[PDB]
Amino acid sequence: ASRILLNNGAKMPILGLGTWKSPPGQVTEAVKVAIDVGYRHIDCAHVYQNENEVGVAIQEKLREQVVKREELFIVSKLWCTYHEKGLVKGACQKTLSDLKLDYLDLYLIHWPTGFKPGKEFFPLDESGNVVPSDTNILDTWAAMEELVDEGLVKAIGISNFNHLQVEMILNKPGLKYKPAVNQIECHPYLTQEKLIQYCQSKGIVVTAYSPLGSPDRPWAKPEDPSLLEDPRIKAIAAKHNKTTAQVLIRFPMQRNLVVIPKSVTPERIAENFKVFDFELSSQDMTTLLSYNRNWRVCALMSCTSHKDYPFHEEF
Numbered sequence: 001a002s003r004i005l006l007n008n009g010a011k012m013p014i015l016g017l018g019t020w021k022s023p024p025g026q027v028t029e030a031v032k033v034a035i036d037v038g039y040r041h042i043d044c045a046h047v048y049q050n051e052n053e054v055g056v057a058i059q060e061k062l063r064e065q066v067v068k069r070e071e072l073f074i075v076s077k078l079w080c081t082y083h084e085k086g087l088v089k090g091a092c093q094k095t096l097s098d099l100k101l102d103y104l105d106l107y108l109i110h111w112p113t114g115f116k117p118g119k120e121f122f123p124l125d126e127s128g129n130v131v132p133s134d135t136n137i138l139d140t141w142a143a144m145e146e147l148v149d150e151g152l153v154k155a156i157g158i159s160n161f162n163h164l165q166v167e168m169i170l171n172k173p174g175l176k177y178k179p180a181v182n183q184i185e186c187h188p189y190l191t192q193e194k195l196i197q198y199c200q201s202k203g204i205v206v207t208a209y210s211p212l213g214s215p216d217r218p219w220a221k222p223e224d225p226s227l228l229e230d231p232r233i234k235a236i237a238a239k240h241n242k243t244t245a246q247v248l249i250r251f252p253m254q255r256n257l258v259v260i261p262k263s264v265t266p267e268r269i270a271e272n273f274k275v276f277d278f279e280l281s282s283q284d285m286t287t288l289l290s291y292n293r294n295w296r297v298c299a300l301m302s303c304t305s306h307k308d309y310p311f312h313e314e315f
């Protein structure tokens, strides 16, 4: 079952390619290979600084008649320094021009935290705390709604919103469109049962990021657990004659989640897609869930400071 029905009436492929930390010199090839082997969903963001190169790949495959625009599902995200209502369209418009698209299938508020606007993506004070902006997320939501009504994006959603924050959008006075997606970190060490159950109960689809535990994250520490090297997970892989990565991708799929593993390695790209020919047992699923430890790749300690920091609450 390759696509899930969103509350805007559209269908979203449950496997997409992530692009965070995909180097600009390699990500054009990575996205071309991904399209060639089956992927139809690419997860992007202005802050990754590689959307132009992603867009070159998309356009080449459109031009080559490999894929049709309607069959692709291209996602990007509104960076934190653009939460002011006056900046949202332009932020979107940049992303469209870079990806060489005239609409996005899905546009997310990347983080609940607005940052001070300017050329800096990560503005810090003379002590290093992130400098917030005085933007209310409801007002940012209203600006996202306008994008739908302008034809620039087919669906809007959120990312890294905790339960109170999703609830805040859903109770927005005058809410016109419900979020379609909440994109959050999720893997056997951070299983998110409460937030996921809450979102699904509201008709919001959850996308799972860092499903392999982001071994290329720049802040990796030796003492950090490692999904890909966890002997318990390797064993489950071995019982199904798949790799560990394949188990880690199949796992959210069986929880009715969308999942976006990143790779710029052609063999891994292809491997990561071969996840529709096997099923984890109920016991496997329960077992993988038992590994939870509230471990986050994206803990973002410099943001703990911010009003809307989403991870003070477990969910």
Ligand SMILES: NC(=O)c1ccc[n+]([C@@H]2O[C@H](COP(=O)([O-])OP(=O)(O)OC[C@H]3O[C@@H](n4cnc5c(N)ncnc54)[C@H](OP(=O)(O)O)[C@@H]3O)[C@@H](O)[C@H]2O)c1
Pocket (backbone or CB within 6 Å): 017, 018, 019, 020, 021, 043, 044, 110, 159, 160, 183, 208, 209, 210, 211, 212, 213, 214, 215, 216, 228, 245, 246, 260, 261, 262, 263, 264, 265, 268, 269, 271, 272, 297, 298
């Ligand atoms: N919205 C948010 O706040 C947010 C935050 C973080 C991430 N995300 C999205 O989620 C995507 C995925 O998360 P991530 O990039 O943090 O990490 P990830 O997908 O968990 O892991 C990426 C790492 O795993 C490696 N890898 C890929 N396939 C592998 C395989 N089959 N075997 C062994 N290693 C493999 C990649 O190496 P190579 O590339 O060298 O092959 C890379 O080092 C991102 O790229 C981004 O699109 C969203």
Ligand SMILES: COc1ccc2c(C(=S)N(C)CC(=O)O)cccc2c1C(F)(F)F
Pocket (backbone or CB within 6 Å): 020, 045, 047, 048, 080, 111, 113, 122, 130, 298, 300, 301, 302, 303
């Ligand atoms: C909301 O705060 C964020 C959000 C994202 C980041 C990232 C990024 S771009 N990611 C974790 C990837 C992603 O957000 O998709 C890198 C470094 C600091 C960040 C911070 C930080 F505040 F720590 F600066």
